[PDB]
């Protein structure tokens, strides 16, 4: 459990993607160098950091991993830029859109020039002295494109989306991956897990294991559908890839208390649990599958909740 | 003093460390070799730093 994809043809799904990046990749394969700075947009969990390795690869570079949380203050990222990094290297910044203000200025001029200017003292001296870095391509992304980054995205080549994953491609991962930790597993359980995967890479590989884990705690031979369903019934996920207390929360707000508009602080307490959690990752799905919505006094079940749970609606 | 080293220090001070911390690193790395450039001294010193 410490192997991934490594060529970009290894990287499953982002077709679109793919192409797009196969051509600004072969062309500074082919120029200078260095790959114009990407970056990218997209919902979490879609394996955003592995294309940054699957990339790095295609060049022949190394990679630098680091947060927007992480950089502190300039220092901590000029001590990336200068030492952390050799000429061709890919730097890649995860939460970029949480750099700091100060951060993010002296970012610029290490994009553009590779060159970063630090200004001494003050008054009519106001004298600059430069640290000049090395080539490098950087590879920042936003788990919310929602203008949240400033002009930064001025200062960027390439700027893509990753998209969701079919659940045919999840499975092909759960698939060639099973294969690697031996582990057998049908066609049809894989893709059984992808329906089930929220559409993301993450969420897939972990259920995969929690299958795996409850699965062959019985058996040895082979995981197929039957095998497979039992087990996520087990967890208890349904058809839509809600979880246990995913149906425990939709449910609390019905029955507890009348399907209208609730309130998170009037919910989180309100059935023992914290708001930015059942907000920060509860909500999220539970709204992408409209069973969850949220207005401008509380939460509110729909229509489809109450149906995929077996009540009538209610008016 | 170092033409040299005032200028890493303060860099250094500039990119959002304790002042008095850097020039602690940066002096002691002057003394390993005292003709070293302000460039060098500076990212010599930023992996010292914490
Ligand atoms: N497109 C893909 N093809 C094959 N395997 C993939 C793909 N995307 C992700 N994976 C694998 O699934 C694992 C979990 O995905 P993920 O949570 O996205 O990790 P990550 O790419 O390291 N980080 P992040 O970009 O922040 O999500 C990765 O470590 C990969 O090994």
Redesign the pocket.
Known sequence: LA???KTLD?????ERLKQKLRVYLEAAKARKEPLEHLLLFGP?????????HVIAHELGVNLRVTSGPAIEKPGDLAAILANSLEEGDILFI?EIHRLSRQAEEHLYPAMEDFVMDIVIGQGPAARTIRLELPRFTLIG?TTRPGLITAPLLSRFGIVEHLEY?TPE?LAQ?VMR?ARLLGVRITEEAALEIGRRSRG???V??RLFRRVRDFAQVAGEEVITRERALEALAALGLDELGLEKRDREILEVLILRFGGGPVGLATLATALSEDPGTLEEVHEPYLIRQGLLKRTPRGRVATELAYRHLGYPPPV | ESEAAEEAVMALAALGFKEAQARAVVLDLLAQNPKARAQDLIKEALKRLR
Do not use: N, V
Request: charged fraction near 30%; aromatic fraction near 8%; proline fraction near 7%.
């Open positions: 192997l991934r994809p290894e990287y499953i799904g982002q979490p969990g879609l394996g955003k950091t592995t294309l940054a995860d992304a994953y491609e991962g991956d993301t890479m993450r897939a590989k």
